[PDB]
Amino acid sequence: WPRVSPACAGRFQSPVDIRPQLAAFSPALRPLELLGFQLPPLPELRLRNNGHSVQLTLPPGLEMALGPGREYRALQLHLHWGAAGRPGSEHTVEGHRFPAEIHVVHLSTAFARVDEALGRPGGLAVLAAFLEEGPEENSAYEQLLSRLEEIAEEGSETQVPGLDISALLPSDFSRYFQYEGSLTTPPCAQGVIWTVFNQTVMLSAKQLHTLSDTLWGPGDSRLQLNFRATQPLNGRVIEASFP
Amino acid sequence: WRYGGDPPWPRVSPACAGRFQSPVDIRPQLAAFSPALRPLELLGFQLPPLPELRLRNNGHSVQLTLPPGLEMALGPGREYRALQLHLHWGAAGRPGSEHTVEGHRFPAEIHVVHLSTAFARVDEALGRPGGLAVLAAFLEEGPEENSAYEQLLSRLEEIAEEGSETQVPGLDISALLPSDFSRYFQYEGSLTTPPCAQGVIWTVFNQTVMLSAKQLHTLSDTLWGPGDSRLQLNFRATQPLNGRVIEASFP
Numbered sequence: 022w023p024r025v026s027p028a029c030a031g032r033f034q035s036p037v038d039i040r041p042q043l044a045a046f047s048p049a050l051r052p053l054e055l056l057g058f059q060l061p062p063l064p065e066l067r068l069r070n071n072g073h074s075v076q077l078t079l080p081p082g083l084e085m086a087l088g089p090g091r092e093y094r095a096l097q098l099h100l101h102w103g104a105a106g107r108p109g110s111e112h113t114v115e116g117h118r119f120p121a122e123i124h125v126v127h128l129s130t131a132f133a134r135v136d137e138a139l140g141r142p143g144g145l146a147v148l149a150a151f152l153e154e155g156p157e158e159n160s161a162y163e164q165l166l167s168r169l170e171e172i173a174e175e176g177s178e179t180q181v182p183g184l185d186i187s188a189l190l191p192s193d194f195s196r197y198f199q200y201e202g203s204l205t206t207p208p209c210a211q212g213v214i215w216t217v218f219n220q221t222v223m224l225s226a227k228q229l230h231t232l233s234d235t236l237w238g239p240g241d242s243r244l245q246l247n248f249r250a251t252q253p254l255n256g257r258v259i260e261a262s263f264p
Numbered sequence: 265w266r267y268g269g270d271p272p273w274p275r276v277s278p279a280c281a282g283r284f285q286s287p288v289d290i291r292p293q294l295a296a297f298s299p300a301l302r303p304l305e306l307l308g309f310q311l312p313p314l315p316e317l318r319l320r321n322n323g324h325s326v327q328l329t330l331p332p333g334l335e336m337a338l339g340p341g342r343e344y345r346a347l348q349l350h351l352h353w354g355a356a357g358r359p360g361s362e363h364t365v366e367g368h369r370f371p372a373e374i375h376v377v378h379l380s381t382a383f384a385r386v387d388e389a390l391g392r393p394g395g396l397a398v399l400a401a402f403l404e405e406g407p408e409e410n411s412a413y414e415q416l417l418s419r420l421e422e423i424a425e426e427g428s429e430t431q432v433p434g435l436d437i438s439a440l441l442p443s444d445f446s447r448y449f450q451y452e453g454s455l456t457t458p459p460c461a462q463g464v465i466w467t468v469f470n471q472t473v474m475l476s477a478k479q480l481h482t483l484s485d486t487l488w489g490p491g492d493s494r495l496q497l498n499f500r501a502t503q504p505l506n507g508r509v510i511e512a513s514f515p
């Protein structure tokens with residue numbers, strides 16, 4: 022990865038191991054505000070297998086704030102997952118890897134283009150939530166997982182009805198960890214604000230199997246275990262929005 | 265534009281009418297303690313006497329332009345380069361700091377303005393989150409002549425006229441700031457002059473810097489501004505926090 026892109030050897034990369042006892046509580050971290058996320062069924066959205074993940078392109082109007090006047094627009098979401106019972110979250114908590122992880126990528130409203138934002142502090146912000154195994158089938162996730170067979174081939178795509186993107190995220194928007202790092206694939210650009218929800222979302226075992234067994238990647242590989250190894254904090258302190 | 269007279273500042277720049285402006289009144293009881301706020305770190309601030317620097321009466325303040333290689337970090341991965349410093353002050357028996365603490369205005373204030381290392385130019389940084397960072401310290405009266413400040417203040421007579429400048433030897437720029445880099449307030453706000461762009465990270469030191477009565481009088485009584493007015497009381501009114509939470513690096 023450093024071979025094909027030197028930025029991946031920077032000092033301040035993602036993902037990282039979260040250690041809640043070492044997190045710094047700041048009461049200045051207010052609840053996340055996410056407006057415009059309740060999409061109607063039409064227009065439909067592009068869902069695509071890009072060889073690294075499944076990506077869902079989001080329309081204009083999904084507004085997000087990390088604080089007063091620190092506003093963002095959602096661009097896309099994608100997921101990270103494992104294989105055959107083995108977990109594939111990117112972030113870990115006290116060394117525990119979760120079954121999967123959802124990432125919603127946003128662009129700061131101070132930047133008109135993603136390419137201006139790359140490498141600039143706070144230019145990009147990702148909301149990250151862990152996916153765990155639960156007893157019930159998750160309705161929000163089923164809308165996407167049920168469409169994966171259609172895009173099983175690397176590079177294929179389809180159109181899916183609009184859905185409540187906020188329904189894919191955990192219950193409490195006031196409880197999260199936050200630090201600054203990087204994209205977890207090339208170009209590994211730094212200055213990305215990562216916000217990792219404390220609470221998780223639950224999908225059924227079948228849903229998780231569907232996530233990790235349907236899509237194919239580059240060559241004849243299954244699209245599985247699409248997570249980067251944990252990176253050192255190098256002095257960065259993870260903040261927490263709760264004591 | 266000028267202090268206490270037209271043109272309103274919104275008519276110069278719409279950003280001067282933003283919700284999240286500086287300076288602010290720091291109420292430390294309402295400050296949020298955050299232990300992620302580590303000691304500030306400065307590199308390259310101890311300058312050789314040559315090349316000289318340019319000290320300028322710009323009509324709104326006295327500024328010292330800083331050379332390239334002055335690096336400042338707010339934390340791991342939060343790196344900045346110093347551009348310049350300037351001052352805010354009052355007048356005979358009247359304080360003129362920009363920031364206040366529980367309504368108290370200090371005699372004067374130093375600001376060292378920095379540019380994030382993600383940006384090559386100021387104009388790309390303006391209005392971007394964390395693009396600009398300012399270090400701010402209050403100036404109070406102490407019993408001794410401050411030798412670092414004397415290097416600048418002894419040259420103000422040469423630049424009494426609006427728009428005049430003079431060359432001064434390099435000095436230890438960090439000697440114009442408090443020795444305590446651990447204890448500070450930090451919030452997001454704006455430039456306090458047009459264009460009043462937001463996204464500026466303000467760091468205000470707990471510890472103050474001491475100047476003599478004579479030095480403080482020299483600072484407020486020597487310079488002339490726009491017209492035939494004395495350059496005095498060159499501070500912007502405090503702006504409402506409007507929901508922002510000031511952070512503190514100590515409980």
Ligand SMILES: NS(=O)(=O)c1c(F)c(F)c(S(=O)(=O)CCO)c(NC2CCCCCCC2)c1F
Pocket residue numbers: 071073074075076096097099124126135145147203204205206207
């Ligand atoms: N974990 S991540 O958020 O850093 C990440 C991925 F892991 C990832 F696989 C992708 S991907 O779907 O696009 C495939 C590899 O690029 C994006 N996508 C982009 C989101 C838009 C921001 C601009 C930078 C490119 C990343 C991406 F941002």
Ligand SMILES: NS(=O)(=O)c1c(F)c(F)c(S(=O)(=O)CCO)c(NC2CCCCCCC2)c1F
Pocket residue numbers: 322324325326327347348350375377386396398454455456457458459
């Ligand atoms: N208080 S402040 O830090 O927001 C401020 C001033 F009050 C001030 F008076 C000046 S000045 O002396 O240079 C007068 C012109 O405004 C600057 N200076 C500039 C620093 C360069 C980077 C930001 C653009 C313009 C302000 C300045 F940044």
Ligand SMILES: [Zn+2]
Pocket residue numbers: 099100101124205
């Ligand atoms: Zn991702």
Ligand SMILES: [Zn+2]
Pocket residue numbers: 350351352375456
């Ligand atoms: Zn200033």
